[PDB]
Paper text:
The multidrug transporter P-glycoprotein (Pgp)/ABCB1/MDR1 plays an important role in multidrug resistance (MDR) and detoxification owing to its ability to efflux an unusually large and chemically diverse set of substrates. P-glycoprotein (Pgp), a member of the ATP-binding cassette (ABC) superfamily, is one of the most promiscuous drug transporters in nature and is capable of binding and expelling a very large number of substrates from the cell. The structures highlight a high concentration of aromatic residues in the transmembrane α-helices that form the DBP, many of which are directly engaged in contacts with ligands. The binding mode of the environmental pollutant BDE-100 in the DBP of Pgp was also previously captured by XRC and it was shown to be a potent inhibitor of verapamil-stimulated ATPase activity of the transporter.
Two mutants, Y303A and Y306A, showed strong BDE-100 occupancy at the original site (site 1), but also revealed a novel site 2 located on the opposing pseudo-symmetric half of the drug-binding pocket (DBP). To our surprise, two mutants, Y303A and Y306A, preserved BDE-100 binding to the original site (site 1) but also allowed strong binding to a second distal site in the DBP (site 2). The differences between the Y303A and Y306A mutants present a puzzling element of their roles in polyspecificity. The pattern of anomalous density for eight crystals of the Y303A mutant and five crystals of the Y306A mutant clearly shows a slightly different binding pose of BDE-100 in their respective sites 2 (not shown), yet Tyr303 and Tyr306 are involved in site 1 formation and are as far from site 2 as any site 1 residue. Furthermore, we detected no significant differences in the binding pose of BDE-100 in site 1 between the Y303A, Y306A, C952A or F979A mutants.
Residue numbers in the entry: 30 to 626, 689 to 1273
């Protein structure tokens, strides 16, 4: 919404840039004007053949006499025109170069200037400006918004004035040479803009319906795949498939209805567009029989108008490129024009010599850019004597750290003044101020150069002698020399990561070359290992005594030798003096001392599509007819102008022109009829395989075992996404692109035959010319992409050192040296600049070449069409035909290169979708094999079970686990932590077979037992019961599948679960909807319902996995009261974390490290004193 003044945007265009644009826009206008003139001459050549075409047939008497005056007219005329076109092509060769070259030159020259000014502006902003902005958005604003500016002031402007030239020069020749047809062509324009407006309304309203249609099926998939362990537990795998299959049926019917309506839309749209033209051209014919126009002029205005009319559309993208470049230039120029109060690039203020370093802060009130929300300094008074070293202590607020900020004049105070020597800090140069202040901060930062270079960021003029003394004077010399490459080592975020106390000494050496008169030491010893701290601390003490120093730290070790110590309380200075004095004061300082002491030929995807042997053959056959039908319009056009250039006697003409225009419209309606079919047929054929794919995939997905859904690679969202995309992508490959790619190869095929068999070696010429300009148009775009990738590679090297500069900013400004990064970024940009110069000559040559090879190609089209062909006995009417036939058949093949990614994007989406069906599990619920025992009673026999989870085969959970529980008993299961408690329930449910050992139920190993039958006698109840969106009676009836459960039977379960209080309390009762879609209710209810569906099954084994986990107060007492009634009549395994409710259990088992450690009845384990009695004691007390 915000934008820029048009002149301010080119403020950096001066002298030549202003000329380049003027000459560029000039030749651009010349380039545009060139095309409608090309059409104007195409009318005069018709007139030439038309006068001879009328007189040659008018003879029917003399033959040799027509070999004289006729050919003489032709050779003076045709050579005059051919001489004229050859000139036009040389014109576009020059102006198209001038057009694109100059604008890309002015763009490159300016964008170089933008970048430099704009990075200069970034480094010039005071710190308070950064505290309110994100540096990351800023740097991306650097590389992206400048790119958008380049796109707008580039060669697009030349294309714009080229297009307006075609537009203006279009209707000028349109109006002057024939004003009537223009108004007639504009009259059908609202119809063409109204038919394409029905597309913006149909597409935008139906693309939502499908995204709503599958969102009903994709919602089924998401509550299933999220609750997958519950559907697997109760074996609703046939229902949840069925229940997704039923939503796929509706998505199919809505998909065929969309295929019917959308194909009715296209066909009617084209048939209105084509009829609109043909009426404007038939009524072109009505004006030649009346002698208001020449047969040549009708063409001249008809093309020049339609050329200029479509030239409007070909200019619209360049407008939006200019405006976006303006809007992008706003926030950029806003940074360049913005002037600071502090600078640091300013050459102003005093530069005191013989600085002695007496510092005082007077009544400083300050607040960071958070402003009125917080005020961190409520007045202040502090002097530090020259040579002395003052230490600042504080409990919190870190108002300590603020004084180092103000002493650098990173910000100015709200009220008060900071004074170095006698002068206010605001009178001294900002740069000289920071050159007389050395700074060592908590986190040290080192730039990605050599050690000597990071030290060289202290001062630019320095010799390895002074680097050596500096590092040796910060005892950092002994420790780099051992490191290889000597001073020539590397540092940075990337490469040679060092010890913290080692990085700080390089920072101390960096600040030491600064020979500062003032020293600021903020938190430097803090957050550092204890032993290297003393190594650094020796350097800090060796860095002082030549300087006045303010130091801030939480290490009270460094503070004793400070000449004065100062404590803060709420930004107010409270205590000051020597260490001993503050201790006698017994205040804040004393109080803090005591405290601290694979693309491949996949045919099988088409073999599954072979479910419909018809529906394709209908579309293909119907597409090829549409293909062969489409040049016949060019054949009609060729003979509407043909017979009427070849007229002779004029009485018969008016009667035929009505006949062709009729045929045309019969040929368009038979084109409508065939194009509805080829769309509907593929549409239906695509939507039905969409179901089969999503059915078989969702079937095969319910076939894998829990081992697969635990994979971090496969989550519920990633599976629904994999489910939707892959099915839609393969639909597109077999859908429109294939009907179109066969319609078009039939288009060119039925066109090339007509052209080849009519014109001899005429067609053989055009088949030498057209492929070359097509290839030359491709190699242009390859070179285009190559230059694009290359410039991206070498401007990111600049933006990379810009990245380093700006997100490490507060350090660089503390060291000054902005002019360093300033110069480095300039040297970095100098390569893309001198590269951007070559870009202009390259784009100009290529574009001018492809334009010239289009104009020269058509000079050869007529000079060969006449002369050697028309001095013979071949006819203009065919040359017209071969043009439209070949040229349209070629531009119809241009759709093949556009639908190419729809094939690859589908094959890749196919690549996964064939794998996902064929993958078979270790434990398949679908296998009908298994024992299905007859005897009812249930044991559980864990024996030597070692188990590790397939996702994390690192820490074992179960290793040598052995349990046995009789029928009708409760097996209490206590654990130190982890799923060692829970893995038992997962292995009995056979979510996994154990690594070693075995688990048995009735004496039979479950591993050889039937998988589905096994789970059918299991009453699993988890800690968070997931309930699908449906009737609570149906969430309950979900406990027994393969059979519909009686109402009184699901009532019996709700009676058991003690949930029947709601189930009548609701207005709907058992038919109320739950799942946080129809109704919401708390967890105690959800849980009871899960108990209800558990015991609908009438299991022989309950499995209670921390059922009271998320629950509170009386809700626990009632759910436990339901669980305690559910057991005592069944085999039970309970791992609930309430050991008070576990006292009345028949056997308690303690799990240690996957081994069973300690077991027995409650009082038995309570008589023993160990883990279980440590467990019961810790909760009962707490
Ligand atoms: Br009559 C008549 C026939 C074709 C005309 O131009 C074409 C041409 Br040439 C090809 C196709 Br496909 C559709 C149309 Br409309 C015109 Br304008 C008038
Ligand atoms: Br786009 C384009 C369309 C026709 C052009 O010249 C003609 C013209 Br004018 C008439 C016929 Br028939 C074929 C061609 Br090719 C040119 Br040059 C460019």
């Amino acid at each position: 919404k915000p934008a820029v003044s048009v002149l301010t945007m080119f403020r950096y265009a001066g002298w030549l840039d202003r000329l380049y644009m003027l000459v560029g826009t000039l030749a651009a206008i010349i380039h545009g004007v060139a095309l409608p003139l090309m059409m104007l001459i195409f009318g005069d050549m018709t007139d030439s053949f038309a006068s001879v075409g009328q007189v040659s047939k008018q003879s029917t008497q003399m033959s040799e006499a027509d070999k004289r005056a006729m050919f003489a007219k032709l050779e003076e005329e045709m050579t005059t025109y051919a001489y004229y076109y050859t000139g036009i092509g040389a014109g576009v060769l020059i102006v198209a170069y001038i057009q694109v070259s100059f604008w890309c030159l002015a763009a490159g020259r300016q964008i170089h200037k933008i970048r430099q000014k704009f990075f200069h502006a970034i480094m010039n902003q005071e710190i308070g400006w950064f505290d309110v902005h994100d540096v990351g958005e800023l740097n991306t604003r650097l590389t992206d918004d400048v790119s958008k500016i380049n796109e707008g002031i580039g060669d697009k402007i030349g294309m714009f004035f080229q297009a307006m030239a075609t537009f203006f020069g279009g209707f000028i020749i349109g109006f002057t040479r024939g004003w009537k047809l223009t108004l007639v062509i504009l009259a059908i324009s609202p119809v063409l803009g109204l038919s394409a407006g029905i597309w913006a309304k149909i597409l935008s309203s139906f693309t939502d319906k499908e995204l709503h249609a599958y969102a009903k099926a994709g919602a089924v998939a998401e509550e299933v795949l999220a609750a997958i362990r519950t559907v697997i537990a109760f074996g609703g795998q046939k229902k949840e498939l069925e229940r997704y299959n039923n939503n796929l049926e509706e998505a199919k019917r809505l998909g065929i209805k969309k295929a019917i309506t959308a194909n009715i839309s296209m066909g009617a749209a084209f048939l209105l567009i084509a009829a609109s033209y043909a009426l404007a051209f038939w009524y072109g014919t009505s004006l030649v029989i009346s002698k208001e126009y020449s047969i040549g002029q009708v063409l001249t205005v008809f093309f020049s108008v339609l050329i200029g009319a479509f030239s409007v559309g070909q200019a619209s993208p360049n407008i939006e490129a200019f405006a976006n470049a303006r809007g992008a230039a706003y926030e950029v120029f806003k940074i360049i024009d913005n002037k600071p109060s502090i600078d640091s690039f300013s050459k102003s203020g005093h530069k005191p010599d013989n600085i002695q370093g007496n510092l005082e802060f007077k009544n400083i009130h300050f607040s960071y850019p958070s402003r009125k929300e917080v005020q961190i300094l409520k007045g202040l008074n502090l002097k530090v004597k020259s040579g002395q070293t003052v230490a600042l202590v504080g409990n919190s607020g870190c108002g300590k750290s603020t004084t180092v900020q103000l002493m650098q004049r990173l910000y100015d105070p709200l009220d008060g003044m900071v004074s170095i020597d006698g002068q206010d800090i605001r009178t001294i140069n900002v740069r000289y101020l920071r050159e007389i202040i050395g700074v060592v901060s908590q986190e040290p930062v080192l730039f990605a150069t050599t050690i000597a270079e990071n030290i060289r960021y202290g001062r630019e003029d320095v010799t390895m002698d002074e680097i050596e003394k500096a590092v040796k004077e910060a005892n950092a010399y002994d420790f780099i020399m051992k490191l290889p490459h000597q001073f020539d080592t590397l540092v940075g975020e990337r490469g040679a990561q060092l010890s913290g106390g080692q990085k700080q000494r390089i920072a101390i050496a960096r600040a030491l070359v600064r020979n500062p008169k003032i020293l600021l030491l903020d938190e430097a010893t803090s957050a550092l290992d204890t032993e290297s701290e003393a190594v650094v601390q020796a350097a800090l003490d060796k860095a002082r005594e030549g300087r006045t120093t303010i130091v801030i730290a939480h290490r009270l070790s460094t503070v004793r030798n400070a000449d004065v110590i100062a404590g803060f309380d709420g930004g107010v200075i409270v205590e000051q003096g020597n260490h001993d004095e503050l201790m006698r004061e017994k205040g804040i300082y004393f109080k803090l001392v005591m405290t601290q002491t694979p693309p491949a030929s996949f045919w099988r995807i088409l073999k599954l599509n072979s479910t419909e042997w018809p529906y394709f053959v209908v579309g293909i056959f119907c597409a090829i007819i549409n293909g062969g039908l489409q040049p016949a319009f060019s054949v009609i056009f060729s003979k509407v102008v043909g017979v009427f250039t070849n007229g002779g006697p004029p009485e018969t003409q008016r009667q035929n022109s009505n006949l062709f225009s009729l045929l045309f419209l019969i040929l368009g309606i038979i084109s409508f009829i065939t194009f509805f079919l080829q769309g509907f047929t593929f549409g239906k054929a695509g939507e039905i395989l969409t179901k089969r794919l999503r059915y078989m995939v969702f079937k095969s997905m319910l076939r894998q075992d829990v081992s697969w859904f635990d994979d971090p690679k496969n989550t519920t969202g990633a599976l629904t996404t994999r489910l939707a995309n892959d099915a839609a992508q393969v639909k597109g490959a077999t859908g429109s692109r294939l009907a179109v790619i066969f319609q078009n190869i039939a288009n060119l095929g039925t066109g090339i035959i007509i052209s080849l068999i009519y014109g001899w070696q005429l067609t053989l010429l055009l088949l030498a010319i057209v492929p070359i300009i097509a290839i030359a148009g491709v190699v242009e775009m390859k070179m285009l992409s190559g230059q694009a990738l290359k410039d991206k590679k070498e401007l990111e090297g600049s933006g990379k050192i810009a990245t380093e500069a700006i997100e490490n900013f507060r350090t660089v400004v503390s060291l000054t040296r902005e002019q360093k990064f300033e110069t480095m970024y300039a040297q970095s940009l100098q390569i893309p600049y001198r590269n951007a110069m070559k870009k202009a000559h390259v784009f100009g040559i290529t574009f001018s070449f492809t334009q010239a090879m289009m104009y020269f190609s058509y000079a050869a089209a007529f000079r060969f069409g006449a002369y050697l062909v028309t001095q013979q006995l071949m006819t203009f009417e065919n040359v017209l035909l071969v043009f439209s036939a070949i040229v349209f058949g070629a531009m119809a093949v241009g759709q093949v290169s556009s639908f190419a990614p729809d094939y690859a994007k589908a094959t890749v989406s196919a690549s996964h979708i064939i794998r996902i069906i064929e993958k078979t599990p270790e434990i398949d619920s679908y296998s009908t094999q298994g024992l299905k025992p007859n005897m009812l009673e249930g044991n559980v026999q864990f024996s030597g079970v070692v188990f590790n989870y397939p996702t994390r085969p690192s820490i074992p959970v179960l290793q040598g686990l052995s349990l046995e529980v009789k029928k009708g008993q409760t097996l209490a299961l206590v654990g130190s932590s982890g799923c060692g408690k829970s893995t038992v329930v997962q292995l009995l449910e056979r979510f996994y077979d154990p690594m070693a050992g075995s688990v048995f139920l009735d004496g039979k190993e479950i591993k050889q037992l039937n998988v589905q039958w096994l789970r059918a006698q299991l009453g699993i109840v988890s800690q968070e019961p997931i309930l699908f969106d449906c009737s609570i009676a149906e969430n309950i009836a979900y406990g027994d599948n393969s059979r519909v459960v009686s109402y009184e039977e699901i009532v019996r379960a709700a009676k058991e679960a003690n949930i029947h209080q709601f189930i009548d309390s609701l207005p709907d009762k058992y038919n109320t909807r739950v799942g946080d879609k129809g109704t919401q209710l708390s967890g105690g209810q959800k849980q009871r319902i899960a108990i209800a569906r558990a015991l609908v099954r009438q299991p022989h084994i309950l499995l209670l996995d921390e059922a009271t986990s998320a629950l509170d107060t009386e809700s626990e007492k009632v759910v436990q009261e339901a669980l305690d009634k559910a057991r005592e009549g069944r085999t039970c395994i309970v791992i609930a974390h309430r050991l008070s409710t576990i006292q009345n259990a028949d056997l308690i088992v303690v799990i240690q490290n996957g081994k069973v450690k300690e077991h027995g009845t409650h009082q038995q384990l309570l008589a023993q004193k160990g883990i279980y009695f440590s467990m019961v004691s810790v909760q009962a007390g707490a």
